[PDB]
Amino acid sequence: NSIKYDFFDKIYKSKMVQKR
């Protein structure tokens, strides 16, 4: 269970990026 982990880290970083 690592593909989900990295995908969600990327999506969360993008999410804070869009919500700075």
**DSSP states of 1-20:** --HHHHHHHHHHHHHHHHT-
Binding mask 1-20 for a copy of itself (x = CB under 8 A): ---xx--x--xx-----xxx
* Half-sphere exposure in the Cβ direction for 10 (13 Å, CA): 6
Shortest separation between residue 17's beta carbon and a copy of itself, angstroms:
13
Shortest separation between residue 1's beta carbon and a copy of itself, angstroms:
8
Which spans of this chain sit near a copy of itself (rule: CB under 8 A)?
A: 4-5, 8, 11-12, 18-20
